[PDB]
Design a protein around this ligand. Structure first.
Ligand code: VW2
Lengths: 407, 548
């Protein structure tokens, strides 16, 4: 079949990212995978006159799967997959009471890739101890991970899916990278059989779907702030309470504490149980209600980038906020793992959970501010990564002054 | 030359070949050039032609008995395409597997033995000048990889790699390593079989046009390679020479801090903390520097370590990989990687030199990270860890630390110094403890300031400060309250800065004030620090900010 021409953003040259060093086990797995892919035509070996590179990883099931980090190449072909062949995002998918995520990435592998473009998909299987130069391939078919693959394949997808869409004019189906997001309102039992219907339809047409993510987007909002609820109160408690309330002022600018501040006019001791005035309790109730409401002026901007910030809370508990401008939260949430756990395993899942929500709600991913040492994350993130996409990220070095502020 | 396939080469987008002009020089040179270009045209490396080719590149001449031809390609290199980078880092001796026998083969004429893509030869054109520019020049061009062209190393390496393929196939027991113009061949074949295999390899390479040395010229162990000594059963660094001088220059401390880091891969315990401190704000390469007294002690202790040689062993994938860590003091750490308890695979050091305030446990973690990265690079796996810290110490710090941190299998080693949490703040305020409302402040212009406190028991102090900053006074306030209080004290401050430093639980710092605060924090039996917004009339605090 004929290949779609792909051009890079004018004045942009191909990716030149370095390949991280890998466990021997992981290297062997990659060599195995790639020796089979070379055999089926999907990739070929390349010479020194190809200077580009894109990192590759191994993740997992009891089977090793290969994962290409196309983040750099995606930015440099954005005109292609976002304006020329951009796939539109349906704002009705966040409302369904059930969304299932089907991996349809194996479709890309039949379609050839534009000849002039293949050079830009080079990658290297690294060797141990720099003993050998590394094994160097490029793709001859559309790759998973690349954002142009589904843009190019969309038309074929629209045809295969049309029959199913007629019989179920209510089911929402959206494509991001190598996954389909399917949201209905059916009862769970019905929704799961609808999902098997679509799985079988896609299979009677050639698209293989791995199977033997059920997300309920009905509870996805900006969680409300929680002022402590106590029978009795002390100098410290009032002090913590005045402090958090003062911080909240930068986000909900209608809170009042003057009455609560006087409650401790003198220089009382920290453990002094102090009762609350009538002019005092006035605010604790006045401010617990201006705070159960939402903010005003908080609108998503699609020309901007999404920012996600995560904070470690203790005892397998993590909290996050998603914004584009400071103190204007589009979304906030709380991930809680459930002994075989570990700090890095939790941060990793949390990132995956936040990214998936972000795709359902806006159709693009956020850039993470990660509370972890850079080198540690670059070492162990692949160990619990189950997704096929990879968000952008950077590492925070300065801690949060008060962790319980967003608790 | 060789019947190797050429790698196709292109010029950078929207560019054309080099048309630089050839300046004249010695007729003595002009002759000795033509004596090279007929012996090279004969051998097929440079065909002669010049009618229509409009490009050119300069050529000079120099001498070592015989003269040598030279071509400044820098202008053509600026227009040739980007190639796959040739190997950046080089293998580490501690990652090699001992082989029964190892041969080193260096191919001569490497680049000239490899053909150059035809459609790209025209851009290598040069010209031997006439006498007094009264005659036309001798027009030439290359058919092989020119010396010092952007493309020559990477293409050579990939051609060698392809030429080796038919032989690595019939010999899947020999280990060949490539490095620039050399080959390093190893095997556990009995020495009579090996020597035969070596001669087969040479004959193979020779059919492809690559000359090589005979045993009558083949090097023998030990091997002097990239500043190492490679022995049959051990490796070490080539001998290190630390100069003695009485005037030390900035350039010369760099050169010395170099050799010291180099030796640290095998000589355990090298320190470079105080000697590097010297070159902090250094620009002038010649500016002379006084050896600080502490630096001189270090240099002497380094000389002592280098007195006697030490060696490292090679790797045996059959045995486990162990790493041990010790603290050296002053934010300095040292580690050794080994499989057996009397010989190390290698050694090294980690120094924070990043973040004024830090603590022992955070540092240990960063160190383990460093070792984990290096282990993967060298051996392809991570090592079991022997660490001077107790599970309870670590579990306490990582459960409460704001970042995520991961540490692999690790066992405790009870070898002092131990790593400990030296104090901890209370999670809730103390009862029966005086409450100090500290504050502090300075003036930017005057640089004169003050810090004080006011307690619930009615006690009050204010101390005057010269040469200070709002940050320094804010910490000064806390130090006052720790000085003037019992073994249990509640402090209340309006400064996130000071709250930030203390909550980080440092055990050492690059500021003397924080060190005296740490001393008090260890002395006390219960300290609860606590924070309120400033200028909010919270009470207690509204009364202390006024005093200051
Ligand atoms: C028993 C061990 C012994 O004598 N050496 C030097 C280490 C074994 O290492 C090799 C293994 C297989 C091919 C070659 C090997 O040697 C070298 C390996 C490397 Cl990676 C670089 N080399 C450089 C030289 C020189 N000169 C020799 C070697």
């Amino acid at each position: 079949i004929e290949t779609v021409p792909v051009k890079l953003k004018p004045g942009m040259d191909g990716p030149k990212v370095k390949q991280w060093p890998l466990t021997e086990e992981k290297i062997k797995a990659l060599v195995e995978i790639c020796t089979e892919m070379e055999k089926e035509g999907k990739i070929s070996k390349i010479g020194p006159e190809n200077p580009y590179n894109t990192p590759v990883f191994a993740i997992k099931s009891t089977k090793w799967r290969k994962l290409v980090d196309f983040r750099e190449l995606n930015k440099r072909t954005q005109d292609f997959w976002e304006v020329q062949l951009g796939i539109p995002h349906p704002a009705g998918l966040k409302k369904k009471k059930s969304v299932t995520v089907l991996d349809v990435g194996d479709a890309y592998f039949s379609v050839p890739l534009d000849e002039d473009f293949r050079k830009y998909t080079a990658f290297t299987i690294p060797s141990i101890n720099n003993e050998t130069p590394g094994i160097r391939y490029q793709y001859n078919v559309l790759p998973q991970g690349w954002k142009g693959s589904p843009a190019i394949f969309q038309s074929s997808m629209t045809k295969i899916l049309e029959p199913f869409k007629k019989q179920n004019p209510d089911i929402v189906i959206y494509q991001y990278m190598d996954d389909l997001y399917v949201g209905s309102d059916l009862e769970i039992g019905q929704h799961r059989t609808k999902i098997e219907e679509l799985r079988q339809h896609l299979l009677r047409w050639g698209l293989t779907t791995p199977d033997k993510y059920e997300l309920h987007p009905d509870k996805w909002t900006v969680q409300p702030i929680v002022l402590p609820e106590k029978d009795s109160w002390t100098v410290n408690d009032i002090q913590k309470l005045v402090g958090k309330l003062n911080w909240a002022s930068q986000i909900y600018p209608g809170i009042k504490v003057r009455q609560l501040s006087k409650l401790l006019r003198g220089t009382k001791a920290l453990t002094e149980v102090i009762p609350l005035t009538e002019e005092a309790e006035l605010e604790l109730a006045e401010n617990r209600e201006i705070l159960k409401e939402p903010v005003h002026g908080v609108y998503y901007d699609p020309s901007k980038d999404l920012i996600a910030e995560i904070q470690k809370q203790g005892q397998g508990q993590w909290t996050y906020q998603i914004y584009q401008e400071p103190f204007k939260n589009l979304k906030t949430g709380k991930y809680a793992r459930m002994a075989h756990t570990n700090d890095v395993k939790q941060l990793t899942e949390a990132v995956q959970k936040i990214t998936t929500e972000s795709i359902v709600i806006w159709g693009k991913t956020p850039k993470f501010k990660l509370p972890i040492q850079k080198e540690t994350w670059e070492t162990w993130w692949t160990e619990y990564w189950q997704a096929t996409w990879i968000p952008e990220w950077e590492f925070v070095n300065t801690p949060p002054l008060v962790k319980l502020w967003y608790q | 030359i060789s019947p190797i396939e050429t790698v196709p080469v292109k010029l950078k987008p929207g560019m054309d070949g080099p048309k630089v002009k050839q300046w004249p020089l010695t007729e003595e040179k002009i002759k000795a050039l033509v004596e090279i270009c007929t012996e090279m045209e004969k051998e097929g490396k440079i065909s002669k032609i010049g009618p229509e080719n409009p490009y050119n590149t300069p050529v000079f001449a120099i001498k070592k008995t015989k003269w040598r031809k030279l071509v400044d390609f820098r202008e053509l290199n600026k227009r040739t395409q980007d190639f796959w980078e040739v190997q950046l880092g080089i293998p580490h001796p501690a990652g090699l597997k001992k082989k029964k026998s190892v041969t080193v083969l260096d191919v001569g004429d490497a680049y000239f033995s490899v053909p150059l893509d035809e459609d790209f030869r025209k851009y290598t054109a040069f010209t031997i000048p006439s006498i007094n520019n009264e005659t036309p020049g001798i027009r030439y061009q290359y058919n092989v990889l020119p010396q010092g062209w952007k493309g020559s190393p990477a293409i050579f390496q990939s051609s060698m790699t392809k030429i080796l393929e038919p032989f690595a196939a019939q010999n899947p027991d020999i280990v060949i390593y490539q490095y620039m113009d050399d080959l390093y061949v190893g095997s556990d074949l009995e020495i009579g079989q090996h020597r035969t295999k070596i001669e087969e390899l040479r004959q193979h390479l020779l059919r492809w046009g690559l000359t090589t040395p005979d045993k009558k010229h083949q090097k023998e162990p030990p091997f002097l390679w990239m500043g190492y000594e490679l022995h049959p059963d051990k490796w070490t660094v080539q001998p290190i020479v630390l100069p003695e001088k009485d005037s030390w220059t900035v350039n010369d401390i760099q050169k010395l801090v170099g050799k010291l880091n180099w030796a640290s891969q095998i000589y355990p315990g090298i320190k470079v903390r105080q000697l590097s401190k010297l070159l902090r704000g250094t620009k002038a390469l010649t500016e002379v520097i006084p050896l600080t007294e502490e630096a001189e002690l270090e240099l002497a202790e380094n000389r002592e370590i280098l007195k006697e040689p030490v060696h490292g062993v090679y790797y045996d994938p059959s045995k486990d990989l162990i790493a041990e860590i010790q603290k050296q003091g002053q934010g300095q750490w040292t580690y050794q990687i080994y499989q057996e308890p009397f010989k190390n695979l290698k050694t090294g050091k980690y120094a924070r030199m990043r973040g004024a305030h830090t603590n022992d446990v955070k540092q240990l973690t960063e160190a383990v990270q460093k070792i984990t990265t290096e282990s993967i690079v060298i051996w392809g796996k991570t090592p079991k860890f022997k660490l001077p810290i107790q599970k309870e110490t670590w579990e306490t710090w990582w459960t409460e630390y704001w970042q995520a941190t991961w540490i692999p299998e690790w066992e405790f080693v009870n070898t002092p110094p131990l790593v400990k949490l030296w104090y901890q703040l209370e999670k809730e305020p103390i009862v029966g403890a005086e409450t100090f409302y500290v504050d502090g402040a300075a003036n930017r212009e005057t640089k004169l300031g003050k810090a004080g406190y006011v307690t619930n028991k009615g006690r009050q102090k204010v101390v005057p400060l010269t040469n200070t900053t709002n940050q320094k006074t804010e910490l000064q306030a806390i130090y006052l309250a720790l000085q003037d209080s019992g073994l249990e004290v509640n402090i209340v401050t309006d400064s996130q800065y000071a709250l930030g430093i203390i909550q980080a639980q440092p055990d050492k710092s690059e500021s003397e004030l924080v060190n005296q605060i740490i001393e008090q924090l260890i002395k006390k039996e219960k300290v609860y620090l606590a924070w309120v917004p400033a200028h909010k009339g919270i009470g207690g605090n509204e009364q202390v900010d006024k005093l200051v």
